[PDB]
Amino acid sequence: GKSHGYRSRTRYMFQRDFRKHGAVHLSTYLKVYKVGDIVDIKANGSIQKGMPHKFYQGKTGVVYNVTKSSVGVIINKMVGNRYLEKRLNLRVEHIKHSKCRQEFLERVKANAAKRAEAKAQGVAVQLKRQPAQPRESRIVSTEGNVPQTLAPVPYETFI
Amino acid sequence: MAHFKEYQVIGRRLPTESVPEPKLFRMRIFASNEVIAKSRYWYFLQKLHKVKKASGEIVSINQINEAHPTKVKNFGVWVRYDSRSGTHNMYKEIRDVSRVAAVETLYQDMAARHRARFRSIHILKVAEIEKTADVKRQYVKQFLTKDLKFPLPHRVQKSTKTFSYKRPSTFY
Amino acid sequence: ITVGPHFKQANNFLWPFKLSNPSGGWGVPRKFKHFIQGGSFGNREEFINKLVKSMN
Amino acid sequence: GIDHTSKQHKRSGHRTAPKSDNVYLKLLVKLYTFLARRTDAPFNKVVLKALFLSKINRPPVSVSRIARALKQEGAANKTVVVVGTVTDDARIFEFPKTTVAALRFTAGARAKIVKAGGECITLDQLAVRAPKGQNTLILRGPRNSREAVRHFGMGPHKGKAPRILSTGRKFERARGRRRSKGFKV
Amino acid sequence: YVEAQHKLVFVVRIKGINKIPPKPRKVLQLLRLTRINSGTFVKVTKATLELLKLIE
Amino acid sequence: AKSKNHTAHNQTRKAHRNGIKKPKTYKYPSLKGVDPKFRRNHKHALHGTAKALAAAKK
RNA sequence: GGUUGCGGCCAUAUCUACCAGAAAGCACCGUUUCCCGUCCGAUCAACUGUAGUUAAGCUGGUAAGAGCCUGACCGAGUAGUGUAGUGGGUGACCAUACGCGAAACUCAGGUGCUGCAAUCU
RNA sequence: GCAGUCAAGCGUUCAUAGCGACAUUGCUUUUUGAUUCUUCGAUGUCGGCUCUUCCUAUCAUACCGAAGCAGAAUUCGGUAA
RNA sequence: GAGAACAGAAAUCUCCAGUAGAACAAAAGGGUAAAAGCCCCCUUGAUUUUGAUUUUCAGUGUGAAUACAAACCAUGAAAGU
RNA sequence: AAAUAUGUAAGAAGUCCUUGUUACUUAAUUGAACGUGGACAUUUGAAUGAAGAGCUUUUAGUGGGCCAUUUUUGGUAAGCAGAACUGGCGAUGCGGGAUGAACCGAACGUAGAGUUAAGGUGCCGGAAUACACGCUCAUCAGACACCACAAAAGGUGUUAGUUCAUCUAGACAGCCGACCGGCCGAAUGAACUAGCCCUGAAAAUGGAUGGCGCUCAAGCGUGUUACCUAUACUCUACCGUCAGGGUUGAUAUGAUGCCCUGACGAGUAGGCAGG
RNA sequence: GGAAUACUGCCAGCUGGGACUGAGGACUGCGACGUAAGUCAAGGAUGCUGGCAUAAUGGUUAUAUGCCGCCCGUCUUGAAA
Numbered sequence A: 001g002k003s004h005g006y007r008s009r010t011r012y013m014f015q016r017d018f019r020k021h022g023a024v025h026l027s028t029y030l031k032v033y034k035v036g037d038i039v040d041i042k043a044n045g046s047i048q049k050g051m052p053h054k055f056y057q058g059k060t061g062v063v064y065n066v067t068k069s070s071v072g073v074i075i076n077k078m079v080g081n082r083y084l085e086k087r088l089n090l091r092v093e094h095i096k097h098s099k100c101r102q103e104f105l106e107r108v109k110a111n112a113a114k115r116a117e118a119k120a121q122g123v124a125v126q127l128k129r130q131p132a133q134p135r136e137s138r139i140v141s142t143e144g145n146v147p148q149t150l151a152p153v154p155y156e157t158f159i
Numbered sequence B: 001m002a003h004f005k006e007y008q009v010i011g012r013r014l015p016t017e018s019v020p021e022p023k024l025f026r027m028r029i030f031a032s033n034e035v036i037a038k039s040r041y042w043y044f045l046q047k048l049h050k051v052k053k054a055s056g057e058i059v060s061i062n063q064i065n066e067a068h069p070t071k072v073k074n075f076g077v078w079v080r081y082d083s084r085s086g087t088h089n090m091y092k093e094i095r096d097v098s099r100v101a102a103v104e105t106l107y108q109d110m111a112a113r114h115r116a117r118f119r120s121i122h123i124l125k126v127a128e129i130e131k132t133a134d135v136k137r138q139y140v141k142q143f144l145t146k147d148l149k150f151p152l153p154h155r156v157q158k159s160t161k162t163f164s165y166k167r168p169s170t171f172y
Numbered sequence C: 001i002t003v004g005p006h007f008k009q010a011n012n013f014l015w016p017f018k019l020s021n022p023s024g025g026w027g028v029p030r031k032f033k034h035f036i037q038g039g040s041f042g043n044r045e046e047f048i049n050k051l052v053k054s055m056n
Numbered sequence D: 001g002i003d004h005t006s007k008q009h010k011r012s013g014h015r016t017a018p019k020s021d022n023v024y025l026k027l028l029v030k031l032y033t034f035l036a037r038r039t040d041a042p043f044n045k046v047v048l049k050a051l052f053l054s055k056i057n058r059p060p061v062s063v064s065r066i067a068r069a070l071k072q073e074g075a076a077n078k079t080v081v082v083v084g085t086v087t088d089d090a091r092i093f094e095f096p097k098t099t100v101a102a103l104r105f106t107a108g109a110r111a112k113i114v115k116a117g118g119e120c121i122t123l124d125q126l127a128v129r130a131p132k133g134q135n136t137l138i139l140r141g142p143r144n145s146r147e148a149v150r151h152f153g154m155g156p157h158k159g160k161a162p163r164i165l166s167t168g169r170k171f172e173r174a175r176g177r178r179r180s181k182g183f184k185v
Numbered sequence E: 001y002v003e004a005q006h007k008l009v010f011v012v013r014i015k016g017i018n019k020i021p022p023k024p025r026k027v028l029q030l031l032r033l034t035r036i037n038s039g040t041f042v043k044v045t046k047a048t049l050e051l052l053k054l055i056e
Numbered sequence F: 001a002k003s004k005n006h007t008a009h010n011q012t013r014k015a016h017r018n019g020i021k022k023p024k025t026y027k028y029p030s031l032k033g034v035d036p037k038f039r040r041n042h043k044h045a046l047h048g049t050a051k052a053l054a055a056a057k058k
Numbered sequence G: 001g002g003u004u005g006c007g008g009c010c011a012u013a014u015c016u017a018c019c020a021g022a023a024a025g026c027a028c029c030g031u032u033u034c035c036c037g038u039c040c041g042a043u044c045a046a047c048u049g050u051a052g053u054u055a056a057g058c059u060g061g062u063a064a065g066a067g068c069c070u071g072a073c074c075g076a077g078u079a080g081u082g083u084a085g086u087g088g089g090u091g092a093c094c095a096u097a098c099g100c101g102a103a104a105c106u107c108a109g110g111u112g113c114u115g116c117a118a119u120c121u
Numbered sequence H: 001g002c003a004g005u006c007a008a009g010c011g012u013u014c015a016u017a018g019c020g021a022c023a024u025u026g027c028u029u030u031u032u033g034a035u036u037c038u039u040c041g042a043u044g045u046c047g048g049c050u051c052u053u054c055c056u057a058u059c060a061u062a063c064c065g066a067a068g069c070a071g072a073a074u075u076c077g078g079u080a081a
Numbered sequence I: 001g002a003g004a005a006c007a008g009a010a011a012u013c014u015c016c017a018g019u020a021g022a023a024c025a026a027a028a029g030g031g032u033a034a035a036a037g038c039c040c041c042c043u044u045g046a047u048u049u050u051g052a053u054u055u056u057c058a059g060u061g062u063g064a065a066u067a068c069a070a071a072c073c074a075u076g077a078a079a080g081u
Numbered sequence J: 001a002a003a004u005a006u007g008u009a010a011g012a013a014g015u016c017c018u019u020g021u022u023a024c025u026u027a028a029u030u031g032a033a034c035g036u037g038g039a040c041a042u043u044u045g046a047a048u049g050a051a052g053a054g055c056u057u058u059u060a061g062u063g064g065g066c067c068a069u070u071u072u073u074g075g076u077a078a079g080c081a082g083a084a085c086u087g088g089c090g091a092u093g094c095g096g097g098a099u100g101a102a103c104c105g106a107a108c109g110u111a112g113a114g115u116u117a118a119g120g121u122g123c124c125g126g127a128a129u130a131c132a133c134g135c136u137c138a139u140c141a142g143a144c145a146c147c148a149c150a151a152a153a154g155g156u157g158u159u160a161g162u163u164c165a166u167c168u169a170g171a172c173a174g175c176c177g178a179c180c181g182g183c184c185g186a187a188u189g190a191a192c193u194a195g196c197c198c199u200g201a202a203a204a205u206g207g208a209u210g211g212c213g214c215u216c217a218a219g220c221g222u223g224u225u226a227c228c229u230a231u232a233c234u235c236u237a238c239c240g241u242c243a244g245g246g247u248u249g250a251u252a253u254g255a256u257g258c259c260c261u262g263a264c265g266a267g268u269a270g271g272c273a274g275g
Numbered sequence K: 001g002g003a004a005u006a007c008u009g010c011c012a013g014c015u016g017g018g019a020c021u022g023a024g025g026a027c028u029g030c031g032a033c034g035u036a037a038g039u040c041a042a043g044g045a046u047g048c049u050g051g052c053a054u055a056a057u058g059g060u061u062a063u064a065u066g067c068c069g070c071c072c073g074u075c076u077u078g079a080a081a
């Protein structure tokens, strides 16, 4: 018979890390989650209550609810062809605080402060990001570095 | 790997804030063009130092013409090559008027008697044989003798008309 | 050629170029080996000009 | 050969002229096709499209729906346009004046429109008075009020209504309709 | 003198439209080469540079 | 007799014809599954901030 | 800077040995009426700060120390792996092309950082 | 089922005249399985008799090589269907 | 490991060591060390109400589960659970 | 502890300032949501593409599948059984692989001209009995992916190469008075490696590198050019389909028209349309 | 030391030979040569000459020749079977 129950195949997945076990520290409990927070989901084996199904491990979603010990998180999973809307009630030991968006705020805020530099001066803005570029012409000095010339090495057995 | 050129190919690791001015490295590469030679370069350098082409850059590439191209020379050729069951090293001697012409005939010989395609051959060193009498392989020595004359018997002359009106002769 | 600020829309304005097969062949026996090995199929760098021009 | 990034020889879903044969309807279109082409008026385009609609897409615009729209701030005097038939509604009492340009008006609609001293304009008359359709208020009847649209998308837990012939008890209230018999929906 | 690396590249698709894996197949569409022997210009950047080489 | 058992072959293909859609989001999402005594008190917080504009405008 | 109450991270903080520790604090320690807990005032409780003490707990240093943390074109562009050909090989396997790229090894360095409060030559 | 290779051992002595353990590379499809492609609007199902032809992995016969071939006999092998 | 009348391999008592090498009904895996283990004290949240969510899924049923609300209780100095 | 594959974000539904509501929440004008009024756009906050974006109803067939590369289970194995990803066959002709469901190339309205792919260019057969360096002589040589098999083990056949030993302090063969010497005058001895070929290599009608036949190939390895021709690519004419635009202001004989423009065209089961 | 030459590449450098095509049907466009009158190769072929009615040419049909082409219908993963 085939065996498909809830936590099957999670053996290595829900394991706590080598030399990290026991009680979970207080940074996890001392974190505040309001609605709209974008959180990463990773289960914790020490806490059995209110933990994600193994699917949502690694997924990231926006918390839609805040309750006593848990936060409801709305997540998007695909079934057939579409994404339906899943909402999980998960405890805080299983919730991270996602660094995905965090930098975007530190981007916008730096963008508005560089806007005042075109307001107080009038130079061109260059706000939107541009990907890495072909580089450029340069000159490489032979001074103190003269190219040392290599050949291929023959074949010899090392054992 | 078609009809051959020699290239000085000079390349280096990319410079870092830690280390500006990393060391330049030069290889002489026998290839058919600059795209292969540049690629050929990174092939061996990745067999020598820790560099990718992604991590490095090429500083220069320059063709090297023969200095005395109408002067007959005797060449030593050091070759590493993989064979069907193993990979081994060889010394061969080639007599020609350039290094290119000699590498050109090098790869054919490695194809003809050892079945060695280009990809399985490394050219370790190719240098001119300084004197005579330092020439090892005897198939070169035959043409080193004093006042060397030989015939070319049994002359076969390509025809044009598909029918010919006399029994031909080979007499040269 | 200079790339520059409006290259996105200047290039996008351009319909993709319909070209004939190379006049005088592809130079190789077999196209789908890489340029470095057997010819065509890859970045041939400056050698794209001899090809594209013969496909024009 | 092409690797096609979209489907060949696809036609757009929209109609072109109506499916109806009514020779007068076909004329009003010949009018407003011309209008919408040679004007800047977006109203003519809108009326043109709405002339091809099917009786399910042109639900009756009730007179009370016209009246409440005149109680809109700033639209009070505008001549209202309905590209379909207009119905009488006894449920109101004091109905204002205006003029209403429609395809058809029910007998109660027409006669009661005029009792308040107003005109029933017919769409070409409206076109001549308002070639750019200016100071016009276009009204639409509800198309989701329909019977058939009540049964659409009938799933478990969708709270829709089933196709059903008789109705009462004994009819589809037992197993699956309550926690007491089977499950509920 | 080490030249500036090239900012501009020309890509002509030399393969037919048959039997192509999805991720390359989608890329060739996004570079607007859906037909054999057709070509477009591409601005070289580590964004599009990865669109090449995957299309190689 | 014996026959096939299962496959996923061709299903990615079928699911990419019309497929894969998107979550089709709106502003003002549904409140489904939110604390009752939030959504209870939240009613009266809005019930009251109504009168505030049923006064101010006059 | 030491020291303590509550800490964050939870070995650069652990282990083993051996020394050093002024001031204050911590302890160790005296007490067995009362609340209180045990077979046993050992742990727990209460009284006292008085009778005594750095021996220990504790804090530091020392160790070609264990472990742990860190670095590197150390090994290694090696193992593996993504893409490719009407590449090689009877095969097993293997090379080359465009890319991604380890762990062991080795050399090297480091051995808690720090919050709120209080207190002390 | 048939045959290689290595050669510890057998053969008084002596690996290999003739053999051959441990292993290991194979061929064959007159064995049996494994499979279920063909045929279930039907390919007559055992054996024999009769007759032809093909195979060779040769029982005899022709010519040979080897022997632990004196002769005689035998054995191993080659060209041989 | 080192130690005590009979007391021996095995009885009960002691100290030191001991990251879990034990225990948690059971299959196996995960999880737990001032505990989730051992032991003791008190209790009946194995209760009421009725919705939502996860797995399986057609996003039906069923089984099992998670986070709440509204009561009414247990426990503890309490926060809590 | 990878590679590959995988969830999320990259804005006007944004970032903030203020302070009204409530029965929730707090030591509390603490919060929590939800509002009022207000600050900022120009690269509006990566690339690339968009043949337009969203939405709804209904209904056919199907619900035996199979194949290739790769990852992969059972099995000695199978043209065997069973999974993963993609591509295909089925449902599909075309050029190539002689032959062929699935391979390579390329997918198809009617045509002309050009050029090519995969594959080829002695003759069958369109296209160099082309150029170049070697190798190979087989009393079944060999001849090109899928593919229509051969292995261990041998070869004093021939070819290149490796290692160790001897040799100008004159060796090794040879002639001359084991060893030594004279002349000679540059190699020698052994163990190896892998190319082509040979042995290994036994089946039943007569037979198949596709066929003739090819031996400094018309074979094998390698290089360089010319050339041949697909329903593919480029240019143009024509038929149809879809899309966008103009137009009864007219003066006849069609506004379902007339006219301009761009793209596209495989198809079984099946749907629909125009006939 | 001063060239030459090869090789690769550019010219909005000048010229010779061949092939297929001539869609459209007053004028509207953008141009170029012009001191100008005006001319042009500038939003699709015109000029000239000849040849043909016992007929040139075009359709059909039979035969021949080069290359090609398995029996439809059906079920089937797969049928010329």
Ligand SMILES: NC[C@@H]1O[C@H](O[C@H]2[C@@H](O)[C@H](O[C@@H]3[C@@H](O)[C@H](N)C[C@H](N)[C@H]3O[C@H]3O[C@H](CO)[C@@H](O)[C@H](O)[C@H]3N)O[C@@H]2CO)[C@H](N)[C@@H](O)[C@@H]1O
Binding pocket: D040, D041, D042, D043
């Ligand atoms: N800025 C002028 C605007 O004009 C508008 O009205 C006029 C037009 O601008 C508008 O024209 C259409 C509009 O109907 C439709 N719903 C949207 C469409 N984009 C508009 O078109 C507009 O944009 C397109 C594209 O850039 C231009 O080609 C066109 O010239 C322009 N008018 O419709 C009206 C004419 O039919 C409004 N009054 C208002 O938004 C504003 O005044």
Ligand SMILES: NC[C@@H]1O[C@H](O[C@H]2[C@@H](O)[C@H](O[C@@H]3[C@@H](O)[C@H](N)C[C@H](N)[C@H]3O[C@H]3O[C@H](CO)[C@@H](O)[C@H](O)[C@H]3N)O[C@@H]2CO)[C@H](N)[C@@H](O)[C@@H]1O
Binding pocket: D167, D168, D169
């Ligand atoms: N209009 C004509 C009348 O219609 C009647 O039917 C209409 C109603 O009377 C009938 O409702 C039945 C009713 O028959 C019967 N005597 C009482 C019953 N509670 C009603 O049922 C009502 O509640 C049930 C749920 O409990 C709903 O399913 C139903 O739609 C609702 N009408 O449902 C119909 C409306 O939807 C009779 N069937 C018919 O014989 C009579 O002529």
Ligand SMILES: NC[C@@H]1O[C@H](O[C@H]2[C@@H](O)[C@H](O[C@@H]3[C@@H](O)[C@H](N)C[C@H](N)[C@H]3O[C@H]3O[C@H](CO)[C@@H](O)[C@H](O)[C@H]3N)O[C@@H]2CO)[C@H](N)[C@@H](O)[C@@H]1O
Binding pocket: G093, G094
């Ligand atoms: N047993 C026979 C065969 O063995 C094969 O075994 C192959 C695999 O085990 C392994 O192949 C790996 C492959 O798994 C992985 N996904 C990609 C990688 N490039 C391959 O690598 C291998 O093949 C490439 C081919 O060019 C060689 O360059 C490389 O040296 C070799 N290690 O190496 C073997 C081939 O060298 C296959 N499993 C399969 O074809 C079949 O089972």
Ligand SMILES: NC[C@@H]1O[C@H](O[C@H]2[C@@H](O)[C@H](O[C@@H]3[C@@H](O)[C@H](N)C[C@H](N)[C@H]3O[C@H]3O[C@H](CO)[C@@H](O)[C@H](O)[C@H]3N)O[C@@H]2CO)[C@H](N)[C@@H](O)[C@@H]1O
Binding pocket: none
């Ligand atoms: N019988 C009288 C005589 O004896 C003769 O003597 C022969 C026999 O004694 C013996 O022959 C044997 C025979 O016995 C046995 N049954 C068969 C075996 N193959 C034969 O073997 C002999 O003959 C064959 C064939 O000629 C040879 O190939 C073989 O080398 C030989 N030893 O060896 C002699 C031949 O070598 C013959 N039998 C016969 O012709 C002659 O007239």
Ligand SMILES: NC[C@@H]1O[C@H](O[C@H]2[C@@H](O)[C@H](O[C@@H]3[C@@H](O)[C@H](N)C[C@H](N)[C@H]3O[C@H]3O[C@H](CO)[C@@H](O)[C@H](O)[C@H]3N)O[C@@H]2CO)[C@H](N)[C@@H](O)[C@@H]1O
Binding pocket: J012
């Ligand atoms: N990317 C900016 C966008 O701006 C949008 O804003 C658009 C609308 O919200 C705003 O529309 C206003 C409307 O709010 C208000 N209640 C009525 C007013 N007449 C509209 O105005 C708009 O539409 C009218 C009518 O066509 C035009 O005449 C006028 O030009 C236009 N501003 O006009 C804007 C378009 O001009 C949206 N907020 C959103 O899609 C997005 O943030």
Ligand SMILES: NC[C@@H]1O[C@H](O[C@H]2[C@@H](O)[C@H](O[C@@H]3[C@@H](O)[C@H](N)C[C@H](N)[C@H]3O[C@H]3O[C@H](CO)[C@@H](O)[C@H](O)[C@H]3N)O[C@@H]2CO)[C@H](N)[C@@H](O)[C@@H]1O
Binding pocket: J019, J020, J029, J030, J031
């Ligand atoms: N509960 C009633 C509500 O209270 C609101 O006020 C409460 C909060 O919303 C308000 O806080 C405001 C906040 O509204 C606004 N959107 C942002 C602002 N920074 C906050 O201010 C807060 O932080 C600052 C320091 O940063 C403190 O000095 C201040 O006391 C504090 N209330 O302070 C109050 C307690 O924290 C408003 N008055 C209003 O919406 C309503 O009356």
Ligand SMILES: NC[C@@H]1O[C@H](O[C@H]2[C@@H](O)[C@H](O[C@@H]3[C@@H](O)[C@H](N)C[C@H](N)[C@H]3O[C@H]3O[C@H](CO)[C@@H](O)[C@H](O)[C@H]3N)O[C@@H]2CO)[C@H](N)[C@@H](O)[C@@H]1O
Binding pocket: J140, J141, J142, J143, J201, J209
């Ligand atoms: N043109 C015939 C060539 O031989 C190939 O086929 C050859 C093989 O099929 C066959 O080889 C078999 C071997 O399988 C089986 N053991 C039986 C037979 N004794 C062998 O034959 C072989 O004999 C020896 C090697 O043993 C070789 O010298 C000989 O050339 C070869 N025929 O011999 C055929 C003829 O030599 C192909 N037909 C073809 O591709 C190739 O060009």
Ligand SMILES: [Mg+2]
Binding pocket: A001, A002, A003
């Ligand atoms: Mg199982």
Ligand SMILES: [Mg+2]
Binding pocket: A012, A013, A015, A016, A017
């Ligand atoms: Mg883990």
Ligand SMILES: [Mg+2]
Binding pocket: none
């Ligand atoms: Mg980990």
Ligand SMILES: [Mg+2]
Binding pocket: A049
């Ligand atoms: Mg529990």
Ligand SMILES: [Mg+2]
Binding pocket: B033, B034, C046
């Ligand atoms: Mg070049």
Ligand SMILES: [Mg+2]
Binding pocket: B048, B049, B050
């Ligand atoms: Mg190095």
Ligand SMILES: [Mg+2]
Binding pocket: B078, B124, B125
């Ligand atoms: Mg050397």
Ligand SMILES: [Mg+2]
Binding pocket: B086, B087, B088
């Ligand atoms: Mg070796």
Ligand SMILES: [Mg+2]
Binding pocket: B091, B136
């Ligand atoms: Mg040497």
